[PDB]
Amino acid sequence: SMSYTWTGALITPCAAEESKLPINALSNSLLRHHNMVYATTSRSAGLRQKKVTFDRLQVLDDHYRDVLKEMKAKASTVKAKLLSVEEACKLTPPHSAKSKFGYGAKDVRNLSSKAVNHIHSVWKDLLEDTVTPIDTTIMAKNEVFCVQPEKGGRKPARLIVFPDLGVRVCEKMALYDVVSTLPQVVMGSSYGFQYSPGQRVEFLVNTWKSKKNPMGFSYDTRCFDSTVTENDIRVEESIYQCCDLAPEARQAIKSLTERLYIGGPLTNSKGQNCGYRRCRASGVLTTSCGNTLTCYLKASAACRAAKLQDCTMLVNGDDLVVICESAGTQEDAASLRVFTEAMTRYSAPPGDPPQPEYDLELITSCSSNVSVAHDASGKRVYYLTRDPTTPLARAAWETARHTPVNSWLGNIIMYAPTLWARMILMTHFFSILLAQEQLEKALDCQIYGACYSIEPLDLPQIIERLHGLSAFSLHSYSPGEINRVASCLRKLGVPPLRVWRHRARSVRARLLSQGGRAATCGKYLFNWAVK
Amino acid sequence: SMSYTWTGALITPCAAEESKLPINALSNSLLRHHNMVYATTSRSAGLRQKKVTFDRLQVLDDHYRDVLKEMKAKASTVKAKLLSVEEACKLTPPHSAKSKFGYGAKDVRNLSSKAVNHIHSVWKDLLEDTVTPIDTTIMAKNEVFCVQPEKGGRKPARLIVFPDLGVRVCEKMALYDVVSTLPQVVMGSSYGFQYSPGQRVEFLVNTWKSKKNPMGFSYDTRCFDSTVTENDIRVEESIYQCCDLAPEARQAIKSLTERLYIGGPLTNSKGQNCGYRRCRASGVLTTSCGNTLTCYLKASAACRAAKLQDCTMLVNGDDLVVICESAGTQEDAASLRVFTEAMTRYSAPPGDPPQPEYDLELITSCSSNVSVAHDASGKRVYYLTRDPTTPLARAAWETARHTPVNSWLGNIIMYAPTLWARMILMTHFFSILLAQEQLEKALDCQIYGACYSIEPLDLPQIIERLHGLSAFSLHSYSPGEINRVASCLRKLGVPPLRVWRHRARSVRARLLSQGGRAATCGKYLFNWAVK
Ligand SMILES: O=c1ccn([C@@H]2O[C@H](COP(=O)(O)OP(=O)(O)OP(=O)(O)O)[C@@H](O)[C@H]2O)c(=O)[nH]1
Ligand SMILES: O=c1ccn([C@@H]2O[C@H](COP(=O)(O)OP(=O)(O)OP(=O)(O)O)[C@@H](O)[C@H]2O)c(=O)[nH]1
Ligand SMILES: [Mn+2]
Ligand SMILES: [Mn+2]
Ligand SMILES: [Mn+2]
Ligand SMILES: [Mn+2]
Ligand SMILES: [Mn+2]
Ligand SMILES: [Mn+2]
Ligand SMILES: [Mn+2]
Ligand SMILES: [Mn+2]
Ligand SMILES: [Mn+2]
Ligand SMILES: [Mn+2]
């Protein structure tokens, strides 16, 4: 069936949408080619609709059926509980879209009688009505990227589909305990979300070294959410039901699947009907768990169809990495094509055909890759890095415009061990915090699904806990990583690394001069700039 | 061993402590005998210390051992999970004591890097150190009561013992999932906290009617927290460990039991050492679950020792109700004494010897009792009520002084079906909200462990959901209930019910005149005042 059927009404914004990077001195201090940085807007919604709309054909086989039976068997060992209205309220993110019914996320979090009474009513309706399609809003996302001249130039806006806040809180009551425990049990070490950056690296490196002659590849599905079929969604529901659940939870899960997860009507910010969805909604509670389980099921089956040897998989939504025993150059190439044809039959064709890789550093998944450097004693240390283009573009954007979110702070924490986060992001932002004497002001930072209130002076402790002390002394990075960073700087018109090392020496001196916590940051975060 | 050993340092306050009800016109509008209303203060801490300090002797027998084996068997069917630091933070109550380490409940709730980093450090310490006694603060509670001339007059302040906020958040990571699920599984229908007031009544009435010749009694232990021994606390820990837990959870539960739950040093608000505890701390996460499990184990054993027939128990902490088949007047009296001697051997002697009752309305537990009235069709309706003295005294106190908590609102909701909440509390407070045009201002209300933000206009929907529509039309209350309310009014110098019915007619007219939501409250909340 068609992933979407549209009416013609447009996907409308609900606030101003900025698309250009504003010429700023501070921002130009970091990046000079401002014209290359842009943000998506509802203006390009049409192009996206075109890409995400297509008929899905799916043919399953015994490889698929076998893996699904194996997953259900593991699922049957899971026990999950219903969250109460109050627990679900307390776990609701602070900045989510307010309800059309007169209350917002803050009212939910504060257990307002208005929010609470309405949520009890939505819950009772879910249990008593298991058929009426539930309303969802469709919006264009506003995200920042760097232009890609080697093609479409600017990317069209991504689309987000979500139900009302009341329903979202009810999804948590029914499924929060399930989505936070089931994936790990079913998939084991292949469940990517259980790992911090260093643990992810550890799993990949140990897996890689365990093969006599390792071969690996990344796979990513073109418009994965659109490739998810009704049968895939019902299969997910059948997996949830294998768990030992409370009766109301079972009833609510079934109702949510029928009325919301399998599909339903799309409404724009104007209240007009935009169309109908027959695929994965990107803004529901089960989006991540569902996508990961489905990608894992199809990829596991595909590995069997392609007869890949001693496969080990790592899955984060539609992002897949498979490491296996090489069967030879031409044999591997042919096996990957068979793998891809199986994934295609199961409905998940790739954006770009996967390619066999014999160098772990060259495999990119979740927009990241493993790389190596050396610690103080000269020992090899593996860590997670990524191309710095998007992180840099977003940093310049946040430098030029106060943003409710500090993605740059999130990158500093997740990528603390990398050459670019240390030399460029840390130097750039601490220089700014010093100049504005806001070194002690807490900033909101979205990381791993949660919004934290982080005081910059806490960074050394945060990084130490997440990456370990060696994060402050890595040196001798790989040529491939150094060249990628250098090229990216040239492309974006950001000062070469020589300049950053010089600027970092100054920031460090300024931090030490203050003593206390500030000096601690100078000592640890910028020990690399010394001598 | 001794429940407490003291040093001599005093239990000190950390803010002003008011003990007298302030002569106020509005408050005197509700109650005239202001001199009878008082609040406890640290001044009487010494008297309490005396009462809660004593040697505990405990002799267990096969009845006890048998019940414990049965509980462990049910416990073994429970699976519980560790909460992450973030989940535990989000579930931390908004007004809990700030940490000595530089952050408070709001910082915890907002996932401040300061709170989060410290909590990770406390967690790591719990796992790596399983012996060092953890610090706790001891404070006198400030609560409002009505004088009891027939004895001690004024009651001494209760004492609360609690660890630092960081530790409290770690208790949730290790045990939140356990304390919210285990009691119900082990105890079934006897676990009192699973019931709303009406469900509690339903369970008691159906149990009562199921006996050929019902006999029942309430039991309450004198200073229960003090009667809990080290063996009782270790037995609780052994029950928790029967659950299918994560390795870190098991380690943290063991460490918390050794370093905190079994006992430890007491520090006052001044930082001075007040003494040492060898019994239940009143302010830990496991206080309620632990007390309920322990009371259930001792009472179950005691029922067997006393050979009570077809016993059915309801347990809320140390508050116990037992309903059984009468064996005759003198037989029941003798069996209750044997029951009490068994409870005493197990270490839990009663405040007042329990007495057999053959009238369900006369059994009071959790300061409450079942009573009957009639709905619109004249059908008998059972509901939960209580002596209105404390609720009234607190209402007058909150009328005279703005309070962070609106216990009166909590009583209106929990006791909506009662004659006194409807005729006195609702009338009194809506009259005030009207006069101050604050009918739409939300008030903080502590109910069932959570703090809600309630808009008065939401009361009809709240009451309907909790008690059902019949709550707005009950009439023909029992003589015993009517006389108790009438006597209490005489004792406190509050206007007789005739006056309230008259005052309610006025409030109702004023509400109807406004239309909308206000008129709804007039129609439902005060339909009893009509004609
Ligand atoms: O239009 C879109 C596409 C994707 N997403 C969301 O992006 C997340 C995946 O993040 P990825 O970084 O894996 O995106 P992707 O490009 O592979 O996504 P697809 O186009 O293949 O679906 C998922 O949580 C998905 O719901 C949107 O919110 N909107
Ligand atoms: O000094 C005290 C006594 C009791 N409590 C707390 O009161 C709650 C029980 O509430 P109850 O209403 O059952 O108190 P009680 O008088 O039976 O208490 P005991 O003296 O027998 O212990 C329990 O949660 C207990 O920790 C205090 O906080 N301080
Ligand atoms: Mn994709
Ligand atoms: Mn993409
Ligand atoms: Mn992807
Ligand atoms: Mn991405
Ligand atoms: Mn991407
Ligand atoms: Mn007691
Ligand atoms: Mn008492
Ligand atoms: Mn009690
Ligand atoms: Mn009480
Ligand atoms: Mn009491």
UniProtKB/Swiss-Prot annotation, chains A, B:
Record note on what altering residue 319 to H does:
Complete loss of RdRp activity
> Known consequence of changing residue 283 to D/L/R?
Complete loss of RdRp activity
Tell me its cofactors. Mg(2+)
Annotated compartments: Host cytoplasm; Host endoplasmic reticulum membrane
Q: Which domain of life is it from?
A: Viruses
Outcome of residue 287 to K?
Complete loss of RdRp activity
Q: Where does Mg(2+) 2 bind?
A: 220, 318-319
Partners and quaternary state?
Answer: Homooligomer. Interacts with non-structural protein 5A. Interacts with host VAPB. Interacts with host PRK2/PKN2. Interacts with host HNRNPA1 and SEPT6; these interactions facilitate the viral replication. Part of the replication complex composed of NS2, NS3, NS4A, NS4B, NS5A and the RNA-directed RNA polymerase embedded in an ER-derived membranous web.
Q: How does it sit in the membrane?
A: Single-pass type IV membrane protein
Q: Which reaction does it catalyse?
A: RNA(n) + a ribonucleoside 5'-triphosphate = RNA(n+1) + diphosphate
Protein name stated in the entry? RNA-directed RNA polymerase
In its UniProt entry, the species of origin is given as: Hepatitis C virus genotype 1b (isolate BK)
What is this protein's function per UniProt? RNA-dependent RNA polymerase that performs primer-template recognition and RNA synthesis during viral replication. Initiates RNA transcription/replication at a flavin adenine dinucleotide (FAD), resulting in a 5'- FAD cap on viral RNAs. In this way, recognition of viral 5' RNA by host pattern recognition receptors can be bypassed, thereby evading activation of antiviral pathways.
Summary of activators and inhibitors of this protein = Activity is up-regulated by PRK2/PKN2-mediated phosphorylation.
Cite the post-translational modification comment. Answer: The N-terminus is phosphorylated by host PRK2/PKN2.
Per UniProt, the cofactor note for this protein states: Binds 2 magnesium ion that constitute a dinuclear catalytic metal center.
* Residues shown, of full length: 2420 to 2950 of 3010
Tell me which residues make up the RdRp catalytic domain.
Answer: 214-332
Record-listed Phosphoserine modification sites: 29, 42
